[PDB]
Design a protein around this ligand. Sequence first.
Ligand code: CLA
Ligand code: CLA
Ligand code: CLA
Ligand code: CLA
Ligand code: CLA
Ligand code: CLA
Ligand SMILES: CC1=C(/C=C/C(C)=C/C=C/C(C)=C/C=C/C=C(C)/C=C/C=C(C)/C=C/C2=C(C)CCCC2(C)C)C(C)(C)CCC1
Ligand SMILES: CC1=C(C/C=C(\C)CCC[C@H](C)CCC[C@H](C)CCCC(C)C)C(=O)c2ccccc2C1=O
Ligand code: SF4
Ligand code: SF4
Ligand code: SF4
Lengths: 47, 147, 143, 124, 740, 80, 83
Amino acid sequence: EEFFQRATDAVSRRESLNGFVALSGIAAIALFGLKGASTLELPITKG
Amino acid sequence: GWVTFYWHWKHLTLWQGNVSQFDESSTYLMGWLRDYLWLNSSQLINGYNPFGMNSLSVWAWTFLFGHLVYATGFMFLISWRGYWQELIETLVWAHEKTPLANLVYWKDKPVALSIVQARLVGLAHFSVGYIFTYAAFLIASTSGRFG
Amino acid sequence: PWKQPELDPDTPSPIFGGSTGGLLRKAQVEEFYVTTWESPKEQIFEMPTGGAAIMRKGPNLLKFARKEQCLALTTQLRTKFKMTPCFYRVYADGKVEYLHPKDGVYPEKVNAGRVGVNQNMRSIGENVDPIKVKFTGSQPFTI
Amino acid sequence: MLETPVTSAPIVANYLSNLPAYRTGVAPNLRGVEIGLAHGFLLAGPFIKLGPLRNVPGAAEVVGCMSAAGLVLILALCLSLYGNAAFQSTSDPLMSSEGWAKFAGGFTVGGLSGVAWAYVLTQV
Amino acid sequence: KVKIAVDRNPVETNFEKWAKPGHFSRALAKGPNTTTWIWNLHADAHDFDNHTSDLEEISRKVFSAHFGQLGIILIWLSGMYFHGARFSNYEGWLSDPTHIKPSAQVVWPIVGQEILNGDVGGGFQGIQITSGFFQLWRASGITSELQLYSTAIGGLVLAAACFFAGWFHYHKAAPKLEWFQNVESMLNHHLAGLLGLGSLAWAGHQIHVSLPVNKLLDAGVDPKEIPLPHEFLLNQSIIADLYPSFSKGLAPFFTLNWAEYSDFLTFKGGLNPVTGGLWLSDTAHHHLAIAVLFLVAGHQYRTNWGIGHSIKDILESHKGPFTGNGHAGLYEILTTSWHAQLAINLALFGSLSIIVAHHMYAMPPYPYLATDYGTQLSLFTHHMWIGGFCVVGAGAHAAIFMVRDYDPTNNYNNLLDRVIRHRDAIISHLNWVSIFLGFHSFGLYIHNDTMSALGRPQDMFSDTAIQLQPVFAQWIQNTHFTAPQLTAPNALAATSLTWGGDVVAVGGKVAMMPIALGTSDFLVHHIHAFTIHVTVLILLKGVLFARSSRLIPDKANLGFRFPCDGPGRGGTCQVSAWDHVFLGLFWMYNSLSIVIFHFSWKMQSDVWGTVTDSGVSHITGGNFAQSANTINGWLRDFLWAQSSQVIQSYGSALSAYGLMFLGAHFVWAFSLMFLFSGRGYWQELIESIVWAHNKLRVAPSIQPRALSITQGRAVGVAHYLLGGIATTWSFFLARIIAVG
Amino acid sequence: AHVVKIYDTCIGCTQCVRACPLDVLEMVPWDGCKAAQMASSPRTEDCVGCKRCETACPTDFLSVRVYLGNESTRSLGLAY
Amino acid sequence: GFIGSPTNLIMVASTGACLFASRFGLAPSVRKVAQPLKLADREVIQTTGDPAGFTATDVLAMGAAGHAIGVGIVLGLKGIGQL
Ligand code: CLA
Ligand code: CLA
Ligand code: CLA
Ligand code: CLA
Ligand code: CLA
Ligand code: CLA
Ligand SMILES: CC1=C(/C=C/C(C)=C/C=C/C(C)=C/C=C/C=C(C)/C=C/C=C(C)/C=C/C2=C(C)CCCC2(C)C)C(C)(C)CCC1
Ligand SMILES: CC1=C(C/C=C(\C)CCC[C@H](C)CCC[C@H](C)CCCC(C)C)C(=O)c2ccccc2C1=O
Ligand code: SF4
Ligand code: SF4
Ligand code: SF4
C-alpha cells in the first residue's frame, strides 16, 4: 500500500501536473526532428 | 465561378495556341464540361494513383478535400434543426444512462446548432469547398502542362 | 383557486412499466415538474414521454422533466376525458411552485382577478425605429 | 426508469462494483494508477502493431511505446483540463477538485508504468 | 362466416364532381383563394384517410385505385408489346441475337433527332433498348410480330376490363368493410390462386410452349421454320420426339413416376452454354415447385370450413417472457389501419426488388441476357432504385400509421408499446453503430487516399499492403461452389457461376465468370452496410418519434406532415416524421448510388469483357483490385475513365443520353434552392411581383403565394432525386452502350 | 428569456392561449374590445418561442409578438 | 398407378389411415381443433348422412393430405433406393 501513493505526491496538484506535462511534451517535441528523427530513417530529413 | 471558368478556358486555349477550340467549343455547355472540366482534369486527378505520384499529388488531395467540404456544406444545409435536436437528446440519454462514462459530465448542455448558425456553417463549408476545389483544379491544370 | 392545493408525493402513480423518455439528471440537479389529477375511473391514456399508461381510480401523480410535457398531458386529459389536472414545479432544494391554474379557473377564462402585464398600449407597427433606441439597452417593443 | 436484465443483473452489478471507477472505498490516486496501467497497457498494442515503422524490426516497439506514452500524456492533460473546468466550484472525493487532480496524477503515473511494462513484456 | 358483403350503387356515376376540382375535402370544397390551394388539390388528392373517417369508403377507394393502377400497368405492357410488334427488329434479332442490338423505339425525323435512330443492325434504325424485353419474349417462345400484336390487343382488353372493374366495384357494387377485413380469406386466395395458380399456369406455358421453342432456337434452326406453339400443344409427335417423356402422355405424373419427367424437368445448375442463360427446364420445374408450395401454403388459414389456422390466435399465442403481451393488438392494427399494411407491403416489396436485382445479375434467367451488358446493368439499377424507393415509402407510411391510426388503448404492453418505450435506446445504439461504421469504412478510404498521396503504398488498406480480405464471403463462395459436390448431390452443377468454376461466354463476350472478392470489395460492402444503417436510423427515428419526444411532447397533434413548430426550443425545423422521410430519401439515393457504382465497376472490371484465345480481356482491365480502395480512384478510374462516351456522344445516336446527362445535372442543381433558402424570401419577391402586376392591373384574382416549407422540401427532394437518377441513368447507359 | 408583447389590437378570442404549449398567456379583463378580454403574458420565462400563439392570432398583422434572445434551460426546451 | 403396385399400396394405406384417424381422435377435424390436441367444436356443414362430424370438406381435406403424404413418402423412398 506504500507504493503508488507518494509516487503522485509531487504531481497531484494541478499546477505541478500541468507544468510537468507541458515540460515533457515540449521536451519530447523538441527532441523530435533533430534527435527524434534522422535516426529511425524518417523520410523527411533525407532528401 | 462562371467568370473564372471563362478566364481559365480562354487563357488555356490561348496559351496552348488552340484558340479555335475555345471559339468552336464554348458555344455549347457540353464543350465546357468536356474540353474544359474533363480534358484539363486529367493531370489533376493523376497526382497520386496506385501507379505512382507526380508533383500534383497535393493538388489532387486538396481537390478531393474541396469536394468533401462542399459535401459537408450540403450536410449542414439540407437538414435544418429538429432531427439533430432529437438525435442530441437521444445521445444525452445514452450518455446519462450508461456505466463507466456517466461519471464525466458536460458543463454546458449539448444542443443542436441554431438555424442562423446552420446557414452560416453550411455557407462556410460550401465556400471553403468551392474555393479549394477551384484553386486545386486551376493550379494543377495550369502547372501540369506549363511552366 | 379558492385555496391552492398542495403537492402530495404519497399519491399513487398510474400503472406503467419502465420509462426511457422520463427523468434525466436534470431532475436531481434542476427543477422537475409533477402533474396530479383525480381519475374517476380506471382508463388508459398516452404519456408524452413514451408509450401508454393506465391511470388508477383516484389520485394520480406523474413526473416529467419539462413543463411542455406537463401541459401536453394536461390538454390531452382535458380534451379526452375533461379531467382538469394541475402540475407543480419542484426545485432541487424541494421548493414547490404552483404553475398551471394560477387563479384555479384555467387561463382560457378571465376570473376578473389577474393583472395584465407585458402589454403595450400602442398598436403594433407604431413602435419606434431601432435608430431611436441605440446604445441604451431598451428594445423598440419593450417600451 | 426502464430496468433491463442487462442493467440489473447481479453479475453485471458485481463486475461494475469492483472496478476502480466504482470501487466502494479506495483513495483516488490508486484508482488513477490502476486506470492508467490498464489503459496504457491496452493502448500500447495498436501503436506497436500497425505504426509508421511496423516493418522495421526493433524500431516498431520503441516507436509505438513512445507514441502510447505521448498519447497517455495528452490524455492526462485533458483529464486535468476536465478537472479544472468541471470541479472549479464546490460526497464522493473523486468527483472533488483535488480528488480529480490526484486521479489525473495517478492516471499519468499508471500510464507511464503500463507503457514501460508493455515495453519490458514485448522485449522478452 | 366469410361471405361477400356488397352495397349496390352507393356512388352515382356523374360528372358533377369533375367540374369542381376540390371536392374530396371540406377545406378545398370552398373553392380556391390562393395558389397553394392548387398544390393542396394535387397533394391531398389520394389521401383518403383525411377525406373521410369511414373505413369502408376508404377501402372502396383503395380497391378502385388499385384497379386503376393495374389498368395503367396493363396499358403500359400492351404498349410495350405493340412497340415490339411494329417499331422493332425483334424478328431480325431472333436470327442473330449476338450481333444486332435490341431496339424497340423509333423516333420521327423532325428537327434532326432522326440521328437517334442508330444502326442497331438487321436493317433497322431505332433506339437501343435496355429493358430486356427481347430476351423475355425469346424466353416466352414468341417468334413473330403477330404474337406480340395479339398480346398487345389482349393487354389492352384486360386494361379496359380492369378500368371497368374499378368503376363497377366503386360506383355499382362496392364491397363492404367486412369483405375487406377477411384477411384469412385474402391470404388464402392470394397464396393459392394469385401466386400458386399463376406459377402453375406459367409452368404449364413453359413446359408446353417455351421449352420446345427455346430448344429449337438453341438448336440453330430458323425461327420461321419452328412450328407454332399450338402445334406443340395439340399434336404430340413434335413434343414426343423433342422430349421422349411426352410419349407417355401424362402417365408418369399420376403413376408417381416423376423421374421419367427428368428430360424436360431438369436440375442442371449454371447457365446454358448455347445462350448464356438459365436452363428453361430448370425454370419449369422451379415454377412447378413454387406452384405446389404456394398451393400448400394457401390452405393454412381458416375461412369457412372449420379447418385452418387463425391469424389472431397465432399472434396471441406467440408471447414470450421478455416481451409482455406477445403480438396481441397487431391483428386489430393490421385489419383497421391501411397505412400499417402499406408499410409492411412496401418494405417487403422493396426488399423483394433488391433480391430481384441481385438474383438476376447473378443468374440471368433469359436467353442471351448476359451477353447484353447494357440490359443487365439497366435492369439491376432499375430494380435497385425501385426497391430503395419502396423501402423509403415503407418507413413513410409506418410513420403515417403511427401518427394517425395508433391507439394507446389497444397498445398498452404489446410489442409496439415496448418499442416506443425504448425508442431512445434503439435510436442511440443505431446512431452509435452508424458512426462506428462510417468511421471504420470512410475513414479507411480517407486513410488510403492520404497514404497514397503521402507516398506510402505499403501503408494502404489494399490487396497488397494490408489485406482485409472478406474471409466470410470467400468461405461462403467456396461452400456454394461445392454445394452440388456434397450437400446438393442431385444438382449437376453449381446454382450460379459467381462462386467459382469455368467461364461461360456467348458470342465472344463473357456471359458469366467467377467473381473474386478482395479488400476493395470488403470496403465497398461495409460502406453499403454503413449507408443502409444510417438510412435505417433516419427512418426509424422518424417512425418512433412521430408521436412525441422530450423536445416536442405533442407532435402527434401537429399531424404527420407539418413543417416545424417554430423557432422555439432553439429551433424545431424539419422535426416531423415527413421531414425525416425527406431527409432519408437523399441517404437512400447516396446508398444506392454507391451500390450501383460498385456494381458497374465490378462487372466492368472482373466480369464483363471479351474472350480471346489468350484469355478474358475485361472492359476496364480489372483495375477494381487496385483503384477502388481510394476516393481518387473512383474519381479517375471509374468516373473520369468512364463518362468519356457520354461527353463524346454528340453527333451519334447516344447523344440524347449526353443531352439528358447535361439536363440531369441541371435538374440536380435546380433542386438546391428549393432545398436551401426558405419561404419568406420568395414570399416577399412574390409580393414585389404582385406590386408589378398590380401597377399594370394584371394581378391574378387567385393570390400567388410561395410554396409551403413542406412543399418546398418535397419539390427539392423530388428534383434532386430526379436529377441524380437521370445522371446515373444517362452515364451508365451511354458508357455501357458505347463500349459494351 | 424571450419577450412576449401584446398590443391593443387583440380582440380577446383566447386563441393564443389555447395554442400555447407551455401556459405562457392568460386572459385578463379589459374594456378596449367587444369581448372585454385582453391577452397577458405573466409567465414569459417559461416561453420557448415556438410562435404558436402568433399562428392562432386572427387579427391582421399580430396582436401577440414573440421576440427571441437570451436562451435559458426553460427557453431552449431541454429535458436535461 | 398400377393396381397392386407398392407405391399405390403404401399411399392408399396412408390415405385410409388419415381418413380413419379423425373419425376417432388424433387428427384435427372441423369438430376437433384446439392448440395441441382435440377439443369439441361446432358442425356448420351438414355431414350428409355421416355419423359425428365427417362432412365433405373433411374428406376433401384429408384426402388431399393423404395423397400428399403418400406421394412424399413414395418419392422419399425412391430417392433412397426403396419403392
Ligand atoms: C502539424 C501538426 C502535426 C505534426 C507535427 C505531426 C507529427 C507527427 N504525426 Mg501527425 N497528425 C496531425 C498533426 C500533426 N502530426 C493531425 C492534425 C492529425 C489528425 C488528422 C494527425 C494524425 C496522425 C496519425 C494517425 C499518425 C500521426 C503520426 C505522426 C508522426 C509521423 C511519423 C513519425 O515521425 O513517427 C515518429 C514516431 C515517434 C514515436 C517519434 C516521437 C514522436 C512522438 C509521436 C511524439 C511524442 C509522444 C507523446 C508526447 C508521448 C511521449 C511521452 C514520453 C515518451 C516523452 C509525427 C510525430 C503517426 C505516429 O506518430 O505514429 C503513431 C501516426 O500514425 N499523425
Ligand atoms: C459525383 C459528381 C460530382 C459532384 C457532385 C462534384 C461536385 C463539385 N465539383 Mg467535381 N468533378 C467530378 C464529380 C463531381 N464533382 C468528376 C468525376 C470530375 C472529373 C474528374 C470533376 C471535375 C471537377 C472540376 C474540374 C471542377 C469541379 C468542381 C466541383 C464543385 C462545383 C461547384 C459549383 O457549384 O459550381 C457551380 C457550377 C458552375 C460554376 C458551372 C458549371 C459548369 C458549366 C458547364 C460551365 C459552363 C458555365 C458557363 C459560364 C455558361 C453557363 C451559364 C448559364 C447561364 C447557362 C463541387 C465541389 C469545380 C470546383 O471546384 O468549383 C468551381 C471545378 O472547377 N469538379
Ligand atoms: C384466387 C382468387 C384471387 C385472385 C387471383 C386475386 C387477384 C388479385 N387481387 Mg384479390 N382477393 C380475393 C381473391 C383473389 N384475388 C378475395 C377472395 C378477396 C377478399 C378477401 C380479395 C381481396 C383483394 C383486395 C382487397 C385487393 C386484391 C387485389 C388483387 C390483385 C393484386 C395485384 C396483383 O398481384 O396483380 C396481378 C394482376 C394480374 C394478374 C392482372 C390480371 C388481373 C385479373 C383481371 C384478375 C383475375 C382474378 C380475379 C380475382 C377473378 C375473379 C373476378 C371475376 C368476378 C371477374 C390481383 C389481381 C388488389 C387489387 O385491387 O388489385 C386490383 C387489392 O387491393 N384482392
Ligand atoms: C396450367 C398448366 C397446364 C396446362 C393448361 C396443361 C395442358 C396440357 N398438357 Mg400439360 N403439364 C403441366 C401443366 C399444364 N398442362 C404440368 C405442370 C406438367 C408436369 C410436368 C405437365 C405435363 C404434361 C405432359 C407430360 C403432357 C401434357 C399434355 C397436356 C395436354 C393434355 C390436356 C389434359 O389431359 O389435361 C386435362 C384436360 C382436360 C380434362 C380438359 C378440361 C375440361 C374441358 C375444358 C371442359 C370443357 C367443357 C365445356 C364447358 C363444354 C364445351 C364448351 C363449348 C360448347 C364451347 C394439354 C394441352 C399432354 C399433351 O400434350 O398431349 C396432348 C402430354 O403429353 N402435359
Ligand atoms: C404502394 C404504393 C403506395 C401507395 C398506395 C401510397 C399511398 C399514399 N401515400 Mg405514399 N409513398 C410510396 C408509395 C405509396 N404511397 C413510396 C414508394 C414513397 C416514397 C417516395 C411514398 C412516400 C410518401 C410520402 C412522403 C407521403 C405519402 C402519402 C401518401 C398518401 C397520398 C399520396 C398522394 O396524394 O399523392 C398524390 C400524388 C402526387 C403528389 C404526385 C407525386 C409526383 C412525384 C412527386 C413526382 C413524379 C416523379 C416522376 C416519376 C418524374 C416526373 C418528371 C416530369 C418531367 C414529368 C397515400 C396514403 C402522403 C400522405 O399524406 O400520406 C397520408 C405523404 O405525405 N407517401
Ligand atoms: C458526403 C457528404 C456528407 C458527409 C460526409 C456527412 C457526414 C455526416 N452526416 Mg450527413 N448528410 C448529408 C451529407 C453528408 N453528411 C446531406 C447532404 C444530408 C441531407 C439529407 C445528410 C443527412 C444526414 C442525416 C439525416 C444524418 C447524417 C449523419 C451524418 C454523420 C454520418 C455518420 C458517420 O459515421 O459520420 C462519421 C464522420 C464522417 C464520415 C465525416 C468524415 C470523417 C473523416 C474520415 C475525418 C476523420 C476524423 C479526422 C481525422 C479528425 C480531424 C482532426 C481535425 C479536427 C484537426 C456525419 C456527421 C448522421 C449522424 O448524425 O450520425 C449517425 C444522421 O443521422 N447526415
Ligand atoms: C365407409 C363408408 C363409405 C365409404 C367411403 C369411402 C371409401 C370414402 C373415400 C374417400 C376418399 C378416398 C377420398 C379421397 C379424396 C382425395 C383428394 C381430395 C385428393 C386430392 C389431391 C390433391 C389436391 C393433390 C395434389 C398434388 C398435386 C396434384 C401436385 C403436387 C402434390 C400433391 C399431392 C399435393 C360409403 C360412402 C360407401 C358409405 C358410408 C360408409
Ligand atoms: C424558388 C422557390 C420558390 C418560389 C417558387 C414558386 C412559388 C413555385 C413556382 C412554380 C411555377 C409557377 C411552375 C410552372 C413554371 C412555368 C410557368 C411552367 C412551364 C412553362 C412552359 C411550358 C412555357 C418557393 O416558393 C420556395 C418555397 C419553399 C422552399 C423553397 C422555395 C424555392 O426555392
Ligand atoms: S419557418 Fe422555416 S426556418 Fe422557421 S422553424 Fe419553420 S421550417 Fe424552420
Ligand atoms: S390570439 Fe391574438 S387576438 Fe386572440 S386573444 Fe391572443 S393576442 Fe388577442
Ligand atoms: S411562442 Fe409558444 S410558448 Fe411562447 S407565448 Fe407563444 S405560444 Fe406560448
